[PDB]
Swiss-Prot record, chain B:
Homotetramer. Interacts (via N-terminus and C-terminus domains) with TCAF1; the interaction stimulates TRPM8 channel activity. Interacts (via N-terminus and C-terminus domains) with TCAF2; the interaction inhibits TRPM8 channel activity. The chain crosses the membrane at residues 58-82, 90-113, 121-141, 147-172, 178-201. Residues 83-89, 142-146 are extracellular. The gene is Trpm8. Residues 114-120, 173-177 are cytoplasmic. Changing N145Q: No effect on glycosylation or ability to form functional channels. This is Transient receptor potential cation channel subfamily M member 8. Ca(2+) binds at E106, Q109, N123, D126. The chain holds residues 671 to 877 of 1104 of the full protein. Cooling agents bind within a pocket formed entirely by the S1-S4 helices that opens to the cytoplasm. It is found in: Cell membrane; Membrane raft. N-glycosylation is not essential for but facilitates cell surface expression, multimerization, association with lipid rafts and ion channel activity. Disruption phenotype: Trpm8-deficient mice have severe behavioral deficits in response to cold stimuli. It comes from Mus musculus (Mouse). Non-selective ion channel permeable to monovalent and divalent cations, including Na(+), K(+), and Ca(2+), with higher permeability for Ca(2+). Activated by multiple factors, such as temperature, voltage, pressure, and changes in osmolality. Activated by cool temperatures (<23-28 degrees Celsius) and by chemical ligands evoking a sensation of coolness, such as menthol and icilin, therefore plays a central role in the detection of environmental cold temperatures.
Swiss-Prot record, chain C:
Signal peptide: none annotated. N-glycosylation is not essential for but facilitates cell surface expression, multimerization, association with lipid rafts and ion channel activity. Homotetramer. Interacts (via N-terminus and C-terminus domains) with TCAF1; the interaction stimulates TRPM8 channel activity. Interacts (via N-terminus and C-terminus domains) with TCAF2; the interaction inhibits TRPM8 channel activity. Cooling agents bind within a pocket formed entirely by the S1-S4 helices that opens to the cytoplasm. The coiled coil region is required for multimerization. Residues 14-18, 36-76 are extracellular. The chain holds residues 878 to 980 of 1104 of the full protein. This is Transient receptor potential cation channel subfamily M member 8. Glycans are attached at N57.
Length: 155, 201, 103
């Protein structure tokens, strides 16, 4: 199976050579060549996106859950979910108290996100009036403004 | 004009020759010994003087400060997400020391300037971040109570957002991202019109 | 699409032996990924099983390969970055480039 995976990655690499070999078409060639000039805009886009993802993910994780102690889920909650937010998915169903519980584990035994902190009464302790505006601003900045800016720079 | 830009570049690189490539100097920064080698070319002019020139250049100081700031952000995140308890542990005390250093530098910058200091957005944001960090410290030391600790944690998270957003400002001297970052100020009125129509609808 | 689909199918499942489902998994799902759907719910080990068939009797996708223990055998740390890069390139960059060229 290790060899099969190696072969699959090698197949990706082999397939990507078609783009290089089809640079002499006289219709696709110039456009393929032009892609090299557009990397700096992509770099700026990724820079802003990464900064915003780091900030939003760290803030949300700190405000919802305490002492995860698991690296895989730390990175899944901090990086992966905000990244998916760029494609239209609301970053968290946990940002709203209504849509919570039954998908959490108080102990890290299970492969589930850590449960949110609770108060003296058994009800969630985070404030929606902080989280919801946060997610609103993040989605507005990422999904709409940044992509349109990238379009303009490409043009 | 090109002459003033060349003068500023020469000051920015200091002793190091401006013809040297950035990746070479960064690599020599990460591994000290290579500065004693000839990888980095010094235009202006004994290894001791080589090292002094290398570490007196504002370029290298800026890169070192950027590394330190990134490490500070990493430590902040680790404390906030993984090692936040009723009684602060060693990493949080180290974080407090680093923030104290930042605060002392901020006070120096305060004293150099007057009230014109607060006429810039980023300086105001820095002051707000330091004040919110102090407020979080104040809230977090009531270890008996279980709500002051969480209030301090939330304060720290918002302050972390504010701290992280400063990277955009500090990376405005890259010569590749800088112009585009500057250009964002010109596009606010279109956003305002968009939001106006959206809100009405 | 060809590259991503072949890689994902090879990394998740072995020896489908069904042409219709081969083309459905290799071509159709990556194509839908252009319209905002994440290419695979199977890219993450958490969201798997109960929608698979070990034998090709049923009209369901073939189940992922399993190890000596009855747990999935693929590595998430390879699949997830793959899907992230693919979605970034397709949904965002390519469409904006098309907009620019049309303009
Ligand atoms: C179907 C899977 C499981 C196996 C992989 C087969 C691919 C190698 C086939 C499938 C789709 C085909 C492609 C569909 C579109 C094009 C573009 C085409 O480019 C041109 O003809 C340019 C002509 C011009 O510029 O005028 C060349 C073939 C290619 C790559 C086709 C040839 C080979 C491809 C990639
Ligand atoms: C300026 C732009 C970028 C943001 C505008 C988006 C709006 C849709 C945001 C801005 C302020 C937000 C509101 C601020 C506070 C609240 C109360 C909140 O209700 C609660 O959860 C209260 C909890 C409790 O009572 O304990 C519901 C969302 C709402 C209207 C937020 C929902 C979304 C709002 C209107
Ligand atoms: C300590 C660990 C956890 C950080 C390792 C992550 C690296 C990717 C960071 C750390 C130091 C950073 C570098 C410090 C200084 C610079 C120079 C900077 O280029 C300029 O500022 C040029 C200025 C000019 O041309 O005038 C680009 C980023 C770089 C390589 C920074 C980019 C990213 C680096 C390598
Ligand atoms: C991972 C989380 C939980 C902790 C936060 C760590 C961040 C401070 C790291 C993670 C991703 C890193 C960034 C990925 C991309 C860039 C852009 C980069 O900008 C340049 O190097 C410009 C170079 C040029 O212009 O030529 C500087 C580092 C930065 C912010 C990296 C350095 C620090 C970041 C934000
Ligand atoms: C440079 C651009 C185009 C890609 C940046 C997108 C990120 C969101 C990707 C890049 C690297 C990816 C990470 C690489 C490795 C892992 C571990 C993975 O955890 C596991 O599944 C481990 C499995 C095990 O322990 O057995 C979760 C995703 C994560 C953080 C991946 C999730 C998404 C990341 C951060
Ligand atoms: F294209 C673009 F860049 F969007 C943009 C285009 C046109 C005009 C303004 C902007 C812009 C610029 C910046 C800045 F350059 F100043 F950073 C923005 N920052 C933010 C946010 N800040 O923090 C958030 C992420 C972290 C959590 C809180 C919310 C989003 N939205 C911005 C919009
Ligand atoms: F508009 C665009 F073209 F996106 C683009 C616009 C501006 C700058 C760069 C690009 C670009 C170019 C190429 C290249 F021309 F070099 F191919 C890209 N290739 C890939 C990927 N490679 O493999 C993936 C598919 C197969 C599975 C692994 C991931 C995506 N993303 C690219 C982005
Ligand atoms: C809320 C913003 C906090 C700013 C606190 C002041 C830090 C200054 C950042 P720096 O001076 C570096 C010494 C960390 C930057 C110019 C590299
Ligand atoms: C020391 C420890 O981890 N105990 C937990 C226990 O509280 C939990 O009920 C069980 C099921 O998740 O897994 C284990
Ligand atoms: C030779 C063969 O195909 N056997 C399968 C059998 O394993 C399976 O239990 C049944 C229900 O799917 O369909 C058939």
């Amino acid at each position: 199976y290790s060899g099969r995976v190696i072969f699959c990655l090698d197949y990706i690499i082999f397939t990507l050579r078609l783009i290089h070999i089809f640079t002499v078409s006289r219709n696709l060639g110039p456009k393929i060549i032009m892609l090299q000039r557009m990397l700096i805009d992509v770099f700026f886009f990724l820079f802003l996106f990464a900064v915003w993802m780091v900030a939003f993910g760290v803030a949300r994780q700190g405000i919802l859950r305490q002492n995860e102690q698991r690296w895989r889920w730390i990175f899944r909650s901090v990086i992966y979910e905000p990244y998916l937010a760029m494609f239209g998915q609301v970053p968290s169903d946990v940002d709203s108290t209504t849509y919570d519980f039954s998908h959490c584990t108080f102990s890290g035994n299970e492969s589930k996100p850590l449960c949110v902190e609770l108060d003296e009464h058994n009800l969630p302790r985070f404030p929606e009036w902080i989280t919801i505006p946060l997610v609103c601003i993040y989605m507005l900045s990422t999904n709409i403004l940044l992509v349109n800016l990238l379009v303009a720079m490409f043009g | 004009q090109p002459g003033v830009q060349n003068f500023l570049s020469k000051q920015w690189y200091g002793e190091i020759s401006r013809d040297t490539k950035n990746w070479k100097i960064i690599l020599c920064l990460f591994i000290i010994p290579l500065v004693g080698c000839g990888l980095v070319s010094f235009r202006k002019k004994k290894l001791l003087w080589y090292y002094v020139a290398f570490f007196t250049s504002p370029f290298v100081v800026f890169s070192w400060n950027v590394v330190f700031y990134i490490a500070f952000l990493l430590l902040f995140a680790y404390v906030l997400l993984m090692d936040f308890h009723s009684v602060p542990h060693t990493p949080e005390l180290i974080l407090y020391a680093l923030v104290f250093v930042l605060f002392c530098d901020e006070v120096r910058q305060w004293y150099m300037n007057g009230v014109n200091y607060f006429t810039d957005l980023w300086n105001v944001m820095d002051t707000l971040g330091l004040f919110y960090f102090i407020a979080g410290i104040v809230f977090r030391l009531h270890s008996s109570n279980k709500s002051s600790l969480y209030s301090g944690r939330v304060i720290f998270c918002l302050d972390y957002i504010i701290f992280t957003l400063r990277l955009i400002h500090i990376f405005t001297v890259s010569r590749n991202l800088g112009p585009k970052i500057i250009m964002l100020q010109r596009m606010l009125i279109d956003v305002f019109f968009f939001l106006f129509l959206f809100a009405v609808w």
